[PDB]
């Protein structure tokens, strides 16, 4: 039911000058490719990657740019969406698929989301774990919406360059166990970070390991993440009004292309009603919603995750 | 339309602790591995690679083993088809591919004829471009076979260790400009190469450029060898009694796959009427031949091998 990365094929593709894509690939049929959100890897769809390509697809996981062995440029605007989503269709294009379905989680999920808006000729079909598509307002920048919105504190915190990176490096195992564990387990707010000084100022040590992880699956990130630490990572949040100007560049225009939104229970940053209106910009919209699932859905919830894909990719 | 090394996906699946295959991927649909001869690479299909793609497969070009990016273990037993071929499974195993449809021009061919006799399970459909299925004599020894046939004298120059690799690593732009030309613009000849001393031992020091083929292309192959050199591909050679106590053994069973034999009518050593007899032991053989082509017949004649091809993988 999970991937030993030894017995995975390794794909590479170089999509501009010093920018190679790393993905593991599994299966024959359609075209299905999955987008890991922060701070993962494309170890994160261990479980849905045999699931999925036992079901008859041809799995492409992603390491996104700034993780794992793909290409970990400094440069903060490397990491913008516009950048992001460009590369992914070139990643297509040097792969000779016009199509792929797009599956996304976290940040991967806002990335499906922008492929499907801006690149729909290229998206046969999309879908989100935890992360809405939410039309963007040219009224109130970002930086207002994080006022409005208390919950997203955490993001300020990782504004800075250097600063979260120093603390997320600093023991990586102490940082992938006190993350990665599910609702009930956790030992991290993310109400105030900033005047707290970190993610970790309080929370324990030596955390615990969680019930949804093995030491060894902890100990694959750590390795992952000492190639190049959490720089290239956070960058996916530094683009704030980058991403603002180009989403605005939409104007109105709907998603028109098959559509899946999951819903996670107990994620409490990327709560389930965040989501309550898309489709009135989405026709085609359909759910799933997962009980009990905190924010790492497919470590959480593999089981639900894998039946809900599976029947939403079989059915269109 | 042909292939820019560093615009293609690259993919590598390590089949054994000692030995990763390195592999070519472009297109969607049924897949096709395409198996290069001796002294090739993945780029000796450069022309059928766009092609197949064009046409809605999903093409998968390898570095044979003892190539290219792929590995190339010392040892000459690494290279004899029992193990070639129970590798080339495993590669199947790990891209999770139930099935594959094989090409295999020259030394490919050869495998791919042994895939289909051993493994039919795995393979689709099976085609070789100049190398004929001959069922295995149980009465005569390869080397017996030699003596009787001396356009193949060649083959006891290749067998000693070290002496081979000598001449053909001396000079690789020598060596491979002076194989790779159309068989009106031959400077060499395998009639008796042995007791000449060499392969290249009165063939011009600085041989012109072939129709068939730029100095850039030339340079790819020249870049490629300089990694691991000849021994690889020479050991290919060296296992002729293991090849034939292995084909042996598969003596009374038939290949009831879809089958494709193409002949070029000016190979001189794999001559077409090698292949007279298949339908005898293959009924439903379907054949393709190709007029004023050489050996090179991916490189020769790439219009007529592209139609023969997808006009084959379309209707059987
Ligand atoms: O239009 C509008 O109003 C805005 C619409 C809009 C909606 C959503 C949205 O989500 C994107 C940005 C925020 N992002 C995260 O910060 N993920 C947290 C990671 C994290 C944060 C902090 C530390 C480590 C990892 C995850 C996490 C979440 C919960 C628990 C654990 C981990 C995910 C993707 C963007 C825009
Ligand atoms: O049962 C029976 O009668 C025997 C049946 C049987 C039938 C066929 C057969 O072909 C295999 C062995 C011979 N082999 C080569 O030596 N290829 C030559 C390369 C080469 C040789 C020498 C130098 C460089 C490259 C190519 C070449 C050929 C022609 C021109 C240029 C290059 C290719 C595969 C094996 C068994």
């Known amino acids: 039911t999970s991937c030993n990365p030894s017995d995975m094929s390794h794909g590479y593709v170089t999509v501009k000058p010093r920018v190679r894509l790393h993905f593991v690939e599994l299966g024959s049929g359609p075209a299905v490719c999955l987008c890991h959100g922060f701070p993962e890897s494309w170890y994160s769809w261990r479980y849905q990657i045999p699931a999925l390509a036992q079901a008859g697809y041809r799995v492409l996981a992603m390491d996104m740019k700034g993780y794992g062995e793909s290409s970990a440029p400094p440069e903060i605007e490397e990491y913008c969406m516009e950048v992001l989503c460009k590369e992914m269709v070139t990643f297509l294009d040097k792969?000779?698929?016009?199509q792929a379905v797009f599956i996304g989680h976290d940040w991967g999920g806002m990335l499906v989301w922008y492929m499907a808006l801006f690149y729909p000729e290229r998206v046969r079909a999309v879908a989100s774990?935890?992360?809405?598509?939410?039309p963007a307002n040219p009224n109130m920048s970002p930086l207002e919406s994080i006022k409005a919105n208390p919950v997203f504190d955490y993001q300020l915190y990782f504004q800075?360059?250097?600063?979260?990176?120093?603390?997320?490096?600093?023991?990586?195992?102490?940082?992938?166990?006190?993350?990665?564990?599910?609702s009930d387990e956790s030992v991290l707010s993310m109400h105030?970070?900033?005047?707290?000084?970190?993610?970790?100022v309080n929370s324990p040590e030596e955390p615990s390991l969680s019930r949804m992880v093995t030491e060894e699956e902890i100990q694959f990130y750590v390795q992952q993440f000492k190639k190049s630490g959490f720089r290239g990572p956070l960058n996916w949040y530094r683009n704030?009004?980058?991403?603002?100007?180009?989403?605005?560049?939409?104007?109105?225009?709907?998603?028109?292309?098959?559509?899946?939104?999951?819903?996670?229970?107990?994620?409490?940053?990327?709560?389930?009603?965040?989501?309550?209106?898309?489709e009135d910009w989405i026709p085609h919209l359909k759910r799933g919603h997962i009980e009990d699932c905190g924010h790492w859905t497919q470590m959480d919830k593999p089981t639900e995750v894998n039946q809900i894909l599976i029947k939403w990719l079989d059915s269109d």
């Open 192 to 200: 105030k970070v900033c005047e707290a000084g970190g993610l970790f």
């Open 240 to 278: 704030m009004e980058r991403n603002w100007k180009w989403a605005c560049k939409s104007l109105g225009r709907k998603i028109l292309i098959p559509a899946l939104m999951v819903t996670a229970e107990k994620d409490f940053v990327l709560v389930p009603q965040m989501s309550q209106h898309m």
């Open 160 to 182: 800075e360059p250097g600063v979260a990176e120093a603390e997320l490096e600093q023991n990586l195992s102490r940082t992938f166990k006190s993350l990665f564990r599910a």
């Open 129 to 134: 774990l935890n992360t809405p598509f939410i």
């Open 95 to 98: 792969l000779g698929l016009s």
